[PDB]
Each structure stands twice: as structure tokens, then as C-alpha cells.
Design a protein around this nucleic acid. Structure first.
Lengths: 59, 126, 59
RNA sequence: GAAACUGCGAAUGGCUCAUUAAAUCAGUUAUCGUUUAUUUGAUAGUUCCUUUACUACAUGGUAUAACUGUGGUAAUUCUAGA
RNA sequence: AUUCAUAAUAACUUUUCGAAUCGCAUGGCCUUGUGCUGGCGAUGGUUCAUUCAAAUUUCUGCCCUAUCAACUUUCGAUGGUA
RNA sequence: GAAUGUUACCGCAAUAGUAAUUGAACUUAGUACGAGAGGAACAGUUCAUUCGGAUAAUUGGUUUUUGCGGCUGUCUGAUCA
RNA sequence: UGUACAACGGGGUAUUGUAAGCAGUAGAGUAGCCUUGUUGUUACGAUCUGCUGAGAUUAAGCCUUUGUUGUCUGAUUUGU
């Protein structure tokens, strides 16, 4: 899938393509509002914590 | 092989176990077993039946998953580049709050300019 | 680690206050501090000429 | 002076005559049995709430669009996040 | 023709309205302070009346049929009371 | 199932009986052939039909597990059972 | 006279569908008390909830079993 993300602090926003089903099962079965740690999904995101705001599915 | 849930009872249904029922509204249901299926033919309520997951839910037994959505405590502390601010100049203006005497001096100079303008007005009228 | 499209890079707010008290506490000034002078202007350059487009104040 | 917000209008107009036989409808009445944006005419000195510090009254507060850029959709006057 | 129009006491109200709006003009008094005052408008606002209407509604009137003479009243038909 | 020394274990095979059967789809192949219309075959793969012999994981059936729970009628003072 | 057997038990597993008892500001409503109520309380009350995926049952042709309690020398017959 893809991940559009924003950093309010800088106020920036960027998109990132991702594979690795077993990086994203981290996210699977979660709400829009919960928080997860990022090295689970990419060590580039180590120490970081994301939150979700929603998304846009297939179709 | 995929694992499913009982359209009545809420159980994992391992392969070739249980049954399926279909309904001319195209709808599908799965059953682990003849028990749930028979309740279904009896057009029953899996929320008034006890031993279902649905009932353990709608009566809140073993609900140990969801805890709390926390409300944080934090400030802005992100002085943004306001697009006409020049963040160095922004801090300069933020620190120049005192010394309203310069404001007072500009205001008195404007009092003088306005007096001169009204005088010129009365003169041009006369 | 610092992520480039988001963390290392930063971005501006496209606008500032249009309200008196918004300005007033955006700089934390006073009840009296000549908000007009604490105005923010935006300069642009139509040609050789430029100009600062200071908006307004309401209330 | 584009866009968006806000305010309005969008219920008029137009077309057609299927249904409908005290039902529409005509003409006549009542509203001492009611709604009336609106136009129009007139119409608020009392309202600081332990109303002697509670206090902004030369005037109070929070959002949010348009925009920024980020994105999904095969696709719709689709839309999300920031 | 009214228990009316209105008024008047006691109370009620999740508390309504009583203008933080805007253009044009710039004037006058001075103890000259950005002191005090002041106009032509535009908007929007409580209620009353009005008006553009609306809703109900009174009397009387409608074609061929009796090879339809009885009908309505279950579950409203008629009336009354709350 | 007596008798063959007893008793036990493994075992040969005279004999007797016998059982598998049938079709379709795909390819071949719109090919072969034929003027054309039309239109094949073996090999090969997937399924099925009829029959047979076994099993019963699951599905279904059956319930005296009178195991569980439920309902009426009546008796046990009540309840409980 | 022993990784022997058995009955009991224990556990597992499978089935039912949440036990009796106790409580409850739940309870359609009703009558009564006075302290009159300022949820006033007493009492009748199918049912509802909690203790409760509870209790009950489980080999009789299910598995297991470091427990408990016992059991283990009766009869007859056969010879190349």
C-alpha cells in the first residue's frame, strides 16, 4: 500500500510506498486514532510514533 | 485454508467442519455445527442465547481488550514561518512588546498630522 | 533519525492573524500595543514595483 | 476583482390533464377558529446577576472554508488526512 | 356578539428580544484629550397592524346508470365528554 | 467339533470361487476426408455412470447416555429435589 | 506381589446452556404504614441481573492417572 503522512510541527507532508505485508500487519486490525511504533514498520521510523487519521481504500 | 467465524455463535471454523447455509437474498452464513444451525432454522436470537460470543459481548463478559482513549496535555511551541513574519523578526517583535513609548510617539505625531490636515481642510473650505 | 521530506524540511504557515486579539496574543503584547504596527505584511512584486499587502483588522 | 463562506431565491415559472363525480370547481360567506418570510407603518431608558471588584464595553472567544501542499480512486458536481 | 383589545398582581421559562454590524460624510464644543459631541444611509431585531398569500370553511348547483335498494358502523359509521 | 503322543506359535497350497463395467468433456481437430455442406480416430489428461468391498475424520440421520435444559397435568404441606 | 489388575477419586476431553442459595436503587404494577415522605418505607409480585461458559454429567466399548483402598495359589485333565 501507500502511506501519506504529515508532520504538523514542521507542517510537512509526504507519501511513501510500502510492501512487506508483515510490516503492515502491525497496522492491521486497528482503529483510526490509535498509535503504533515505527521501527515495527520501518527502522527509518525507529523511535517515532505515528498516529492515524484515516485513509482511502481500494475503489 | 482460511478460518472463519460462526454466523450464529462466533467460532473459528476449521476446514470441512461445520456447514454453510445460503439464503436467496444471496446471503451467506456459516455454522460450526448442527446446534447453531438448528437454532438458525428456529430463527432464534444469538443475543438472547448465552454461550455465544455475541452475548458475552452485549453483556460485557471477558471484555478485556479496549481500555481508554487518552487526552494529551501539550502546547503549540511550534513558531511557524508565518509567510510574512521572518521568524527572526517574529521573535524580535515578540520580544519588543514593551517600549510602548515609541507607539505613543508615533500616535502624537499622528495627532499633529491630523490637526494639520483638519486645519488645511478648514482653510481650503474658507 | 530525521526524515527529510518531513522532519529535516520545514514549511511556512500561509497566513497570520486578521483579528485584533489574535495578533495581540500571537505576540502577547498588551491591550494597547499598536497592533497596526505589529501587523504582518506580505510583499509581492507585480513588476519592478513591489508592495506589502497588509490585509485588515476586524473587531 | 476570480474562488469560498455568509445571505437569499431555488416552493415561482413552465408543461400535461392520468386520477378525481359534493370531490375538485363557479359564484357566495366566516376565521370571535389560525400561519404569514416578506414589502409597508409604528415599536424596546428597566437586561452589569450577592447586579461595592464579578468586569472587555473604545468591545469578548472558538472554529472552518477558499488557499498551501500531501493522497486514494476506472469512474461520479467522490473525497480524506495535514 | 366574546372569557375580547389592553391593563393589573403571584409565580413560572430548559430563558426569548433588548444591535459587539457595515458604507458615505466629515462637521461642531471645549477644561486640545486622538476629550466630548454630531449627520445621510445600508443592514439586521421583539411585537402589533398591514400587504403578497395559505389553510380550513358556509349555502346552492354536475353527466349516464335501479340488469346497483338499501348503506355506513369490525379497525369510526353519528354524536356527546376529557 | 472328538480322534491322529500332548500342547502352543509360525506357515506352504490340492482345491473351489472370483469382478470390474460404461460414457462424456478437453487436445487431436473444424484437422483427416470431401465440391461443399458437413465432419472423424488411437495415444494423453479431468470427471462421471453401474457394480463391488472396506470405513465413519467431517456432513447428515438415529437416541434409553433418560446426559443437560425447558413445558403441561397431577402427588409429595411449602420451596428444594 | 508389579511402568500387574481393579474399584473410587483426580485431571483432561466432550454435552448442556449460566446452577441451588444469597443479594440487588431492576422489576409490569398494587395495597398498607406513619415520620408523610422530600427514592418515605412495609408488604405481594411472572420475570431480569451478579456471584456463574455456571453448576450438572462423562463410559457404561473415550485418554490419562506418582493419590486412596484393596486383589493375586480354586477346580479338572492330558504322555511319544
Amino acid at each position: 500500500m501507500k502511506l501519506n503522512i504529515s508532520y504538523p510541527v514542521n507542517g510537512s507532508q509526504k507519501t511513501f510506498e510500502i510492501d512487506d505485508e508483515h510490516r503492515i500487519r502491525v497496522f492491521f486490525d486497528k482503529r483510526i486514532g490509535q498509535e503504533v511504533d515505527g521501527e515495527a514498520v520501518g527502522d527509518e521510523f525507529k523511535g517515532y510514533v505515528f498516529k492515524i487519521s484515516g485513509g482511502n481504500d481500494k475503489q | 485454508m482460511k478460518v472463519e467465524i460462526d454466523s450464529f455463535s462466533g467460532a473459528k471454523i476449521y476446514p470441512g467442519r461445520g456447514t454453510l447455509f445460503v439464503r436467496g437474498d444471496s446471503k451467506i452464513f456459516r455454522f460450526q455445527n448442527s446446534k447453531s444451525a438448528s437454532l438458525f432454522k428456529q430463527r432464534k436470537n444469538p443475543r438472547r442465547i448465552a454461550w455465544t460470543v455475541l452475548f458475552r459481548k452485549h453483556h460485557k463478559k471477558g471484555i478485556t481488550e479496549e481500555v481508554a482513549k487518552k487526552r494529551s496535555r501539550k502546547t503549540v511551541k511550534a513558531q511557524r514561518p508565518i509567510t510574512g513574519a521572518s521568524l527572526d523578526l517574529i521573535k524580535e517583535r515578540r520580544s519588543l512588546k514593551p517600549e510602548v513609548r515609541k507607539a505613543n510617539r508615533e500616535e502624537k505625531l499622528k495627532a499633529n498630522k491630523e490637526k494639520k490636515k483638519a486645519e488645511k481642510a478648514a482653510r481650503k473650505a474658507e | 533519525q530525521e526524515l527529510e521530506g518531513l522532519t529535516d524540511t520545514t514549511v511556512p504557515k500561509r497566513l497570520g492573524p486578521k483579528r485584533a486579539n489574535n495578533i495581540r496574543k500571537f505576540f502577547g503584547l498588551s491591550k494597547e500595543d499598536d497592533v497596526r504596527d505589529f501587523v504582518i505584511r506580505r510583499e509581492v512584486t507585480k513588476g519592478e514595483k513591489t508592495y506589502t499587502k497588509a490585509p485588515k483588522i476586524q473587531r
